[PDB]
Design a protein around this ligand. Structure first.
Ligand SMILES: CC1(NC(=O)O[C@@H]2CC[C@H](c3cc(NC(=O)Cc4ccc(S(C)(=O)=O)cc4)n[nH]3)C2)CC1
Lengths: 298, 274
């Protein structure tokens, strides 16, 4: 840890203490996550062991790379690739002028690619929020903060309850589903998609029941037809008010009919029917950004 | 071949190839104890059997034990010359790393030092867990022997509506096949065969080659060497009978099969050597 010189503190949160460092010989800048082991009674935190092992096998252009893990003096340094800005600060800076639609389409496309890579490797992110989406000066956006991530088995079992930040939490989590998998990340990305379009959080709830009612107020109170088994979920109440689904022309006005279709499929109540990351890449919303590969029908 | 059905969330072939490709990332040597001339293969069985009993006391998952087994075998392949008294520290620390990775509410550090009867302190475990993770290049996400059995059981009981992520298979027959695998893992010569081969070979002894091939994708010629090696271990289980599905207080019955159990065994591993 000699060639690195701290430049500025990026922030301290649930992730830990992140500094912006600069290599003196090469000029490289990195993001340095500092973990004080003398403070941790249980040794290396479980979130750190998970994140390190998952990221050493998730090498993808749309995932923030883990470069090195250095254990020096009762401290654990995690060297990450550096990106200069998170998506939340970019959307706020763009709130008056609006993010250009080609850039929204490009960002969502890249996010779906990095997410499809995570899911094909059987990894749930479980904390997709604009603060965890990092962009550089070359038009790229990348998934970051895999501390809340978990690799799921085939089949899955009952995992940690009440995951994902509240505003981006899927309705099946709010209703207390036993099992969950890749659909929770697609919901979060659908919320982020609409947030880039409207420059405002789609469901800015303050409690679990208020988050659920905000979802019901926009997408309609779900029933057994649109979501088989919803009435049997532990947190479902028959006393839930009945709201009608709002026309997506009012939810996302600037979005065209291809965008509204993709957003609807990412916000489907039924997690089994909710569009997958790979299928979303094939949606006609990106037909101008990508061309399909020939499929071997064997 | 690939036994997975059409997956809505990714290419069924891609998910399977990724699971297969990482098996080449994680190397195993069935003769890593030749790097430690002071150790004998029986000591490894005594340690792994002890970790099994530790898992059942704290109701740890089967995945947690097999993670500790894989961390133990791969860490030893990187080291040279180890004494007997150091085996307990490496084993309990591998289980400490595994429990923090898999369990939602894992046991605390002092409890891992508590089961060692004072032979391992809390600071010794924290020193050992860092040496293990650093020597393994932080490659702590392998496909365990028991994880393959979970895949094979879901595909065996796949309905016409292909949904492979929601679990659905008899718990009674799952723990019976796991019982055979828990015995075979005590013998160090199992590392000759890949983890996916060992699980498919144990499934074959409780079913058939047709069922094995439909859910594992491996031809009979791939597992014949493993099946013939697993021959003695399979009959010792058949001679004593199949075990019953236990109920663990505080654990839901839909997850009761995933809890690691412990039988005396050991003597069963010796009957297979004959
Ligand atoms: C920090 C957070 N959690 C997290 O776990 O991320 C991991 C660990 C470190 C890695 C990183 C972060 C970054 N960049 C940024 O986060 C954004 C940023 C850049 C510079 C400054 S400044 C003017 O110097 O104060 C302020 C803010 N690149 N790589 C990825 C939310 C993303």
């Amino acid at each position: 840890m000699e060639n690195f010189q701290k430049v500025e503190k990026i922030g301290e949160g649930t992730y830990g203490v992140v500094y912006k460092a600069r290599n003196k010989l090469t000029g490289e800048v990195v993001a340095l996550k500092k973990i004080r082991l003398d403070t941790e009674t249980e040794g290396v935190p479980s979130t750190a062991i998970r994140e390190i092992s998952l990221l050493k096998e998730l090498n993808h252009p749309n995932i923030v790379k883990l470069l090195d893990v250095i254990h020096t003096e009762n401290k654990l340094y995690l060297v990450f690739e550096f990106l200069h800005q998170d998506l939340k600060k970019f959307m706020d800076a763009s709130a008056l002028t609006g993010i250009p639609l080609p850039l929204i389409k490009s960002y969502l496309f890249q996010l779906l690619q990095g997410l499809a890579f995570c899911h094909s490797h059987r990894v749930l992110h479980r904390d997709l929020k604009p603060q965890n989406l990092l962009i550089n000066t070359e038009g790229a956006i990348k998934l970051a903060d895999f501390g809340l991530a978990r690799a799921f088995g085939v089949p899955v079992r009952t995992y940690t309850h009440e995951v994902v930040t509240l505003w981006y939490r899927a309705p099946e989590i709010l209703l207390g589903c036993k099992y969950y998998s890749t659909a929770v990340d697609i919901w979060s990305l659908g919320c982020i998609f609409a947030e880039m379009v409207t420059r405002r959080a789609l469901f800015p709830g303050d409690s679990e029941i208020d988050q659920l009612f905000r979802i019901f107020r926009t997408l309609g109170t779900p029933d057994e037809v649109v979501w088989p088994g919803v009435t049997s979920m532990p947190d479902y109440k028959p006393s839930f008010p009945k709201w009608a689904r709002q026309d997506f022309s009012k939810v996302v006005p600037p979005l065209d009919e291809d965008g509204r279709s993709l957003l609807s499929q990412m916000l489907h109540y039924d997690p089994n029917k909710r569009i997958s990351a790979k299928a979303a890449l094939a949606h006609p919303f990106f037909q101008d950004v990508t061309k399909p590969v020939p499929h071997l029908r064997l | 071949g690939s036994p997975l059905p059409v997956l809505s969330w990714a290419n069924r072939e891609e998910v399977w190839k990724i699971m297969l490709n990482k098996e080449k990332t994680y190397l195993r040597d069935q003769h890593f104890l030749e790097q430690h001339p002071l150790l004998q293969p029986k000591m490894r069985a005594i340690l792994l059997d002890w970790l099994m009993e530790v898992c059942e006391v704290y109701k740890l998952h089967r995945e947690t034990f097999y993670l500790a087994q894989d961390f133990f075998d791969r860490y030893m392949a990187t080291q040279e010359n180890v004494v007997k008294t150091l085996l307990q520290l490496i084993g309990i620390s591998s289980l400490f790393i595994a429990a923090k990775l898999e369990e939602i509410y894992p046991p605390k550090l002092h409890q891992f030092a508590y089961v060692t009867d004072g032979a391992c302190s809390g600071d010794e475990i924290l020193t050992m867990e860092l040496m293990i993770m650093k020597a393994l290049k932080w490659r702590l996400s392998p496909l365990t022997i028991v994880s393959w059995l979970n895949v094979y059981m879901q595909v065996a009981y796949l309905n016409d509506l292909h949904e492979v992520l929601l679990p659905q298979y008899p718990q009674q027959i799952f723990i019976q096949i796991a019982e055979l695998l828990d015995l075979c893992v005590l013998d160090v010569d199992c590392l000759e065969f890949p983890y996916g081969i060992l699980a498919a070979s144990a499934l074959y002894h409780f079913s058939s080659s047709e069922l094995m091939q439909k859910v594992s994708g491996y031809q009979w010629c791939d597992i014949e060497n493993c099946v013939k090696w697993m021959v003695p271990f399979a009959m010792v289980i058949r001679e004593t009978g199949s075990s019953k599905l236990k109920h663990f207080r505080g654990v839901a019955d839909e997850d009761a099969h995933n809890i690691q159990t412990h039988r005396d065994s050991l003597d069963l591993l010796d009957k297979a050597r004959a």
